[PDB]
Design a protein around this ligand. Sequence first.
Ligand SMILES: Nc1ncnc2c1ncn2[C@@H]1O[C@H](COS(=O)(=O)NC(=O)[C@@H](N)CC(=O)O)[C@@H](O)[C@H]1O
Ligand SMILES: Nc1ncnc2c1ncn2[C@@H]1O[C@H](COS(=O)(=O)NC(=O)[C@@H](N)CC(=O)O)[C@@H](O)[C@H]1O
Lengths: 576, 581
Amino acid sequence: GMRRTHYAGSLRETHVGEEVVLEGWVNRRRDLGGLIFLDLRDREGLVQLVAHPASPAYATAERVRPEWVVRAKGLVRLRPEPNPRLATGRVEVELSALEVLAEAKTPPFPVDAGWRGEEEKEASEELRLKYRYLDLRRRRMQENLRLRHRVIKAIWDFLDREGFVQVETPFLTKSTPEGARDFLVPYRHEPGLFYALPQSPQLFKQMLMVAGLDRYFQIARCFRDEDLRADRQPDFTQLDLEMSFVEVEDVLELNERLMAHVFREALGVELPLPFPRLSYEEAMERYGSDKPDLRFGLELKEVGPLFRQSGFRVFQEAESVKALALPKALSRKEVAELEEVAKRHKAQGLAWARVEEGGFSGGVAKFLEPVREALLQATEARPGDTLLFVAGPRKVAATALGAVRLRAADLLGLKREGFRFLWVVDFPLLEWDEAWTYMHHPFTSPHPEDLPLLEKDPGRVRALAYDLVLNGVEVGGGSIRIHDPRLQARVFRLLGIGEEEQREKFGFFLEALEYGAPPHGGIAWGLDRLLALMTGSPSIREVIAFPKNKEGKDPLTGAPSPVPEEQLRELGLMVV
Amino acid sequence: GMRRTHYAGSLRETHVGEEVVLEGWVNRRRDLGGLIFLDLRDREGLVQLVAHPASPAYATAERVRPEWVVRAKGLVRLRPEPNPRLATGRVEVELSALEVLAEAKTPPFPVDAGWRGEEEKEASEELRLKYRYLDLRRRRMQENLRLRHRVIKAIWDFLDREGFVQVETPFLTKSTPEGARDFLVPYRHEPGLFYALPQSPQLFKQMLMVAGLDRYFQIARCFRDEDLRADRQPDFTQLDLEMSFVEVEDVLELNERLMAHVFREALGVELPLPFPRLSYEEAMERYGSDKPDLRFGLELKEVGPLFRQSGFRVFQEAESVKALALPKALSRKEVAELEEVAKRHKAQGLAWARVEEGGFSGGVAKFLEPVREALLQATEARPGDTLLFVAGPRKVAATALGAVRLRAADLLGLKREGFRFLWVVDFPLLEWDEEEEAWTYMHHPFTSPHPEDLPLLEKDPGRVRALAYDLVLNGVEVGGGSIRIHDPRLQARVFRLLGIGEEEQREKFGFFLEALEYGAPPHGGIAWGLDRLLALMTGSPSIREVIAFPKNKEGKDPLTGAPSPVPEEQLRELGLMVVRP
Ligand SMILES: Nc1ncnc2c1ncn2[C@@H]1O[C@H](COS(=O)(=O)NC(=O)[C@@H](N)CC(=O)O)[C@@H](O)[C@H]1O
Ligand SMILES: Nc1ncnc2c1ncn2[C@@H]1O[C@H](COS(=O)(=O)NC(=O)[C@@H](N)CC(=O)O)[C@@H](O)[C@H]1O
């Protein structure tokens, strides 16, 4: 069997009197009063080893250095005084034996402090990625990775109970000139032919519904050669799922219970069900964003129809006027800060006014007095508040003041805590291109109520699509799919997408619909983004074991790197 | 919630009297005396629907064709005569409503037979792949993928219980060597730069032991550009795992318990523990193969010294001869078949001879009668058998006859049953190629030599044992692994022996070698071939039967048309062009 009797960090007072054998890394050494104290570290935490002058281990204990790997043997004793910052804090190990298994160079950054419950100084992320195997020794990184394990196991447990079948889908598949750019893989035996990495399992998982598997899931790797962001890697992980014979309601309710199960089991957090839902239109109107942050209020209010008889032409003639009431008298600097946030979001400007006991003061206060009663009933502003207004096209005014609202939260120091999920539903199927564009993929079903509006009034057609939002971040997205090939053809005909282009991009899938596809729909979570939010991480790199840096490269291995020209000649390709 | 009240295949006589809502595919339609009988299919199986002329459902039922998708409502009744071939066979649904959710044209091959409990005609595999989404409707294919699901879930339950941390490793990286070519990915922003797809997560899981995670696993996708074979796909799946502070035995016992759990939970099969073990030497000495098939006997016997003083120079001069006593009298055409498979395995020839009541019968029975009493004691070949022989070097003799042994099982109709696992252990650090007569290495260069053999690394490399092990099932390699090198000095020492200078060390493994200098713990691990295991668990002829959307035997994808060209514009954006012949 194993030589170690316990994980080092698992020793408690219940083990006093036992002889133990431990293996781990030297976190830190301390010489105090002729005793040698060694913090022994493994993944379950630190335990204090003590070498006494009489002990056979005494000389060895004096020469060991941080990060050396050792095997220790001794007796579990109570500490004279416990250290409550360690779960092993009541006990220590009186060393009888100490053996060196590997020496270690001094690491380029410290990894010992987190294991003592001390704050850790921020290190260069580029240095952390270069020595990622050392960065992953830190307690916070192991907690992230172990939480990610617990989340995926919880997903498996739940979806297996609900009758879902995990199916693994191809990584080498068809290159399509649609969507984001594909990562390509050269096919050695016929130069000029390429596989592509999958942007998502979408077509495969729909084909699994055509195959009658009823319900599917996969922890799926997705590859998109696009520009990067703090929650955006060249390859990332989705929880991908698809069900048959469902309506929007069935997909949402399943995902709510799954998410509640995940948070309960992996974080010990209780999520109230059901999640709140807002139409896309409601979200834009009340928050100015299709991914609202519900951790604070400060909703936007449409006050356009209060100023149709006003002398203030910029309010009076505007298509929309959005108002926001902040519970604090702002600095003129702060107002100008918010004005700049509004202008950066296409707004013509940001009007403002202070609310007093009997009226308004400053900014556009003069033009607000005539409608004071209605303006206060619509905004519910109180004496002391600041009123912020953006006037213009309806979508511009909403989005500008929604960004202003987000910035206002920071400038007011609002405590934003917990996990606030919501569904955004009833997205528009289409959007005009300065033609007609869709959101994500063209297999999203139109609302059956809106079918006649496809050709008569396309911009008003609702899709059966939904986004899952957590604390103002898009953690998931899906839809009910088109399963009638005659309706899919009708959507393509409306999109101007010719039959030759359909067969080139989607021919094998469109043929599949001719053999009886069931009603079906699904979703994919951004699993890295969820875990980042679950851990309060500033970037999804904190929840990926070996990510790329924010520039798409890997400082650890050096990829991407050149290859010998003989390796590239074998593929029949050459650098231009 | 769902309109559906039950899965179609789940209805039983206990449901008689209930009104049900079902959704699924029309497996078959039969018309009889005005009634319309629809076998409704979903993933749980078939149930008969009955549409009566008087029903509101009837007009719709008249339109329905095979593979149409319908929603059905009605009352469960007993059938006047049950169908004992069906789980729902005692009952039927008297339809009150029927709605078509999707029409369907006739499939290019039938999917209905297996749901009825009837044998299925073999269809062209290239056609099944072009329409894989229809092929996956068959009961057999669904059984395979749901078994694949249960195996992975069982793996997660066991290893999570044992404290392993699942960690996902990169696919756009620099690759570890496992014996194949790398699949490359052009880096768009600087032509001439490439990613590699990982042949395995080898170096990442070792770095995870450097990171102190103690024990890791991953259901890992691996990518290898190598020659085609029905047991290998260009991209395939491993159960990959690694452990810290372990010896060989620790890794072997954990894997035995894991495999026993998988078979119990997914197949209801008990596997006796522990698995038998054979050294690499003992495996080939007795079976002429490092992946022995233990489902039958016919072991190889060493008859070397019994020819030191005879006239047959082939048997006297050879480094070894071995014998196999097939309990039957082979035909002259059968011995030619075995000779072909023997000579195909670089054998000098297949010496043969029957055995009668006291003497022999032809072949090399001339040089065989001199030692009829001594050799018969070794082989124990009752009269009526045949005796096959190979003469030559040690490795060539066993391998050639061991290959004949395997063919003999097929030509003799041996009933080989069940699941026979074994560990093959104590592989040499180097394996000698016969053709290229050079020192290859089977397992990757991070495999640790046996610590007692470290002085032989410089004095006598071919005597060095490796701390490696292969898991074998029914003559098939389902897993392989080793204890690794954690000392940076020793790892460089083993690189320089394998023909890798300091320059190549830094370029290919510099980052990993430096990691070893920060306190790497003892570690070791293994990886299963998950597709291979599943193919064996289902009795499938190839791993394509247990992969949802595999490539064909030629490595292409007929469902989607991959691999395919890409526009000239997309190609030049990568700063690459195809070389002209
Ligand atoms: N580069 C990136 N890095 C990290 N996370 C990312 C990401 N790009 C997207 N995500 C995350 O992946 C989620 C799903 O991806 S997706 O929105 O592109 N949709 C779909 O894929 C459909 N097929 C699913 C369906 O329709 O069933 C997003 O909401 C993000 O959280
Ligand atoms: N092309 C292919 N298709 C399908 N299955 C395959 C295959 N190539 C290999 N396998 C299967 O994958 C298993 C493991 O792969 S391997 O032997 O290359 N070893 C290792 O990888 C070490 N790193 C593990 C370690 O040392 O920890 C083999 O036993 C086969 O069953």
